[PDB]
Each structure stands twice: as C-alpha cells, then as structure tokens.
C-alpha cells in the first residue's frame, strides 16, 4: 500500500 | 500526504 501512496505523490 | 495532490488538482 505504501507504493499506492508513492504513485499518488 | 494525499492532500498534496488534492491541493494541486
């Protein structure tokens, strides 16, 4: 899920 | 941190 956030950013 | 994108958009 951390990676989902990295993409969002 | 998602708020970064909400501001930008």
Task: Work out the minimum CA distance from B5 to partner chain A, whole angstroms.
Answer: 7
At which residue do the structure tokens 């941190």 appear? Answer: B1
**B1 in Cβ contact with A9 (< 8 Å):** yes
What b-and-e string marks burial along B1-9, b requiring 16 or more CB atoms within 10 Å of the CB? eeeeeeeee
Resolution for this PDB entry, in angstroms: 0.8
For residue B5, which phi and psi values (nearest 5 degrees)? -75, -40
Sign of CA dihedral B1, B3, B7, B9: positive
Contact B4 A9 (CB under 8 A): yes
d(CA B8, CA A6): 16
Name the method of structure determination: X-ray
DSSP readout, B1-9?
Answer: -THHHHHH-
Q: Name chain B contacts of A8, Cβ cutoff 8 Å.
A: 1-2, 5
Reported as half-sphere exposure (CB side, CA atoms, 13 A), residue B6 has a value of 3
Task: List Cα–Cα distances, B6 to A1, A7, B2, in angstroms.
Answer: 19, 14, 7
């Amino acid at each position: 899920l951390a990676a989902a956030l990295h993409q969002a950013l």
